[PDB]
Amino acid sequence: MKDPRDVLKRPVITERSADLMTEKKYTFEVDVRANKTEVKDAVESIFGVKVDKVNIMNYKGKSKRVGRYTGMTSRRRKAIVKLTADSKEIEIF
Amino acid sequence: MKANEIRDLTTAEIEQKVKSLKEELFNLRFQLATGQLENTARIREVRKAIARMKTVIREREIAAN
Amino acid sequence: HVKKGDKVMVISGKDKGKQGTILAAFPKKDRVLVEGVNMVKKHSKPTQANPQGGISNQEAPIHVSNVMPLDPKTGEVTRVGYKVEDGKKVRVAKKSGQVL
RNA sequence: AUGAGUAGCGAAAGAGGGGUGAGAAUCCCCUCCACCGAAUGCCUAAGGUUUCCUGAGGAAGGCUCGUCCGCUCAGGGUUAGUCGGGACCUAAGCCGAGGCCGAAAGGCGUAGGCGAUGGACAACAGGUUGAUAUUCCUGUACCACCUCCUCACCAUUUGAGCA
RNA sequence: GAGCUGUAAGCAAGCUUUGAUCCGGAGAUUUCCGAAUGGGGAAACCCACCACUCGUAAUGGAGUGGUAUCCAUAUCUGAAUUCAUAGGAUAUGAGAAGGCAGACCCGGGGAACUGAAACAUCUAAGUACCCGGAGGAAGAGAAAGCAAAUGCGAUUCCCUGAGUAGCGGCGAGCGAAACGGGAUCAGCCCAAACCAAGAGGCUUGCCUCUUGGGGUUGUAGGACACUCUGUACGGAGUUACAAAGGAACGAGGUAGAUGAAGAGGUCUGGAAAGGCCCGCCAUAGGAGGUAACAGCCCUGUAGUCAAAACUUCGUUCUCUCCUGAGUGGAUCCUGAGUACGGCGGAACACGUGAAAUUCCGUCGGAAUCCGGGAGGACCAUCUCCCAAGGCUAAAUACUCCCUAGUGACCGAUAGUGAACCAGUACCGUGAGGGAAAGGUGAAAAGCACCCCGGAAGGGGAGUGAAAGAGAUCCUGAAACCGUGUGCC
């Protein structure tokens, strides 16, 4: 239980994400109940690279007004990993 | 495919079977997030297959006691 | 009481007398789409195609109770009845001894 | 509906030249002029909750106008071993195993806990984006724990450690 | 048995006759909170210990199980003290405390406004409300009864008795019971008390221990004691009367199948189910749709049939369970809290009184069948009946639900507060209060194109039976606001 592919959900592709990716940093969306250590091990196992540091952050939901109804979107958790200088680059397509 | 599921032995029905489906789902979701997937029923059919495998394994385990 | 790909005959409406084949079925609303019947002149939306397009001539659905099939033998309007169970329940004609 | 195109439009200095636009007293740029300065400056509580950044908009809201906005529609944005709180401590008060009272419901209270507005406790200078920075980047540091494999002196009541 | 991927109408990407989507029976998975139970807490969150397991050397890293308090059952361990308190570890208890249907029923507390033309006694009323227990119903039960002869025979509910007898500042008012007619049926039964055997405690002795046995016990005659009886054949059918279980048939519930007969001709209409002229079906003219009003157009109706799997009753078989009668001389008669004395209550329809009857506190307090209680104070005769131990179906009450129906009930200011994303929006610190809002057309066939305009909005052209039908789009009144004009 706690397979590593359950921690990572999907990559993040913006201008900021590519700017960071220029410097061997990669941005992911992870499960809302996973701490930095499982993120580190999961990245190590899935891709086979060397990890140096991990930084994590929490996001709240947003209010939307489609039609005459109102609601809220779901929370998010974002992680930024930094590979070492010798490690290969992860082929994020 | 349920009969073919039963035919496999227990370790084969989890090892190298519920693992390949997991990794395939991972790659599929990555491709969709990037923006190039085309066919999109693959996600649903893969998830249904995984549920099938888990249910047959659990049925075996329950019947074992 | 009738399905896709059958020869029917319209018995009521502005198109009574005409006959054709079924092209689609809508079991949810009891509407059917007979070929060559109930033509409409749809004013197509602004362009949204290679030409502009604003005049078409397509078909419109008809309530299912306004059509009913043709007897294979005599060849006219005939009520329908099931249960021959020739290995499987199969529709039969009433004003004949025939099938479908 | 009448009162009636009447009362009001909520303390304060602007003028010109460009611009953009279907449209400008009211929006952008420039130059002069004016007001606060133990604040109308900066940083940051409680409380608020996306109001923050970029591109479009001209139905409703702005006591007028509007090409503009804390308004409407789409995308983005918040990085900590050292900062504040928890894997530390207790005050007033509160809860309370057994226990003592009381037609019932309940009231009080010992051992034991919870509870900051207080006590303990390791990091500083500079740079950078349209939106974060003792957190990101570059330099020099400190603190607790382990020996994965180590290294040098130095091993059993011939006592190291021990509150 | 042919299409399908919910509202939801775009849009891609897919699946199914190798039978999808869909309907019913049985299974599996089931994040976090909540009685919430490892500890804490501002419900939706933090922090642990012990066993294994993953990963490096550890940490915090990660996964799967266990760990609340109280009550019963065994154990070993026993302070002050040579014993009992207290302490551990067991399997617990599929704990049950927790919830609800704003209904029905048992018990404990228990108002006031109001009426009496004012007001204490009375009434409101053992009502409202609070607390504790339940069950599918609860409660009540087999005479120490009614009553007055000819006597009847456990309880409960309806009709009548009857607004009668009775209580009452004799006011206002409150208000029975028995007899008679019905609904269901049960003479329903069980208890060690006198006795016996045995045991095994046990100073001789005892006194519990288990068995028999005994009470369908009152006309006071049963029982203990004393003469017969057949023990298989009857009762549970497990609903009181002991209690566990199986095996076959039948009828239902949860999904379905089949099911007669007009395109009749003709007229008007955008469209016939309508008009006129003709036919058929019926154990089927109950309903709802379809471009207008349908027994013969569609889904259906009357009749017949249906179940792998769970369930509800009924019958039978298996299967368990051992008795009832005649006779008199000591002993049990199961039941010591009865009944008093105040004193309060306390219920009785009855307000302490002429008053019987029932209960609760407090002082004293029985006899034994040649006895005891009652017949509305007592008082002698007569007549009925045996308290101080238990169990018991049916006939009655009430709907949170589910299934099928029906109304000289409503028709959008009505009917539920709510026909519409309603206990919502709003208001309040909180308990709490609480709205407004239905209709295009048969079918979107929802206005290509041209012109004015920044757009909004128009004028043409088209669809349609209708465009004065064009998005709060059926009909559309009045108040209110305007344009033109005949007479002043």
Short mmCIF file of C-alpha atoms in Angstrom, two decimals, chain C residues 2 9 15 19 22 26 28-30 33 41 50 53 63 69-70 73 77 80-81 87 96 99:
data_model
loop_
_atom_site.label_atom_id
_atom_site.label_comp_id
_atom_site.label_asym_id
_atom_site.label_seq_id
_atom_site.Cartn_x
_atom_site.Cartn_y
_atom_site.Cartn_z
CA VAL C 2 -41.15 -1.10 -35.47
CA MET C 9 -46.33 3.64 -44.56
CA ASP C 15 -47.74 13.24 -45.47
CA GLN C 19 -44.00 5.43 -47.71
CA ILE C 22 -36.74 4.04 -41.32
CA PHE C 26 -35.72 7.36 -30.60
CA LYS C 28 -36.99 7.61 -25.38
CA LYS C 29 -39.56 9.95 -26.96
CA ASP C 30 -41.45 7.59 -29.34
CA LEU C 33 -37.16 9.35 -38.60
CA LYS C 41 -35.93 24.34 -44.44
CA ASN C 50 -16.50 25.98 -45.66
CA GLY C 53 -24.83 27.81 -45.87
CA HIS C 63 -44.47 10.24 -33.81
CA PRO C 69 -45.56 -1.60 -41.25
CA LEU C 70 -46.42 -3.42 -44.48
CA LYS C 73 -47.53 -11.08 -48.70
CA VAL C 77 -51.09 -1.83 -43.76
CA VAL C 80 -48.32 -6.63 -35.65
CA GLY C 81 -48.15 -9.63 -33.33
CA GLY C 87 -36.02 -20.63 -31.34
CA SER C 96 -51.28 -12.97 -43.13
CA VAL C 99 -43.02 -13.08 -40.58
#
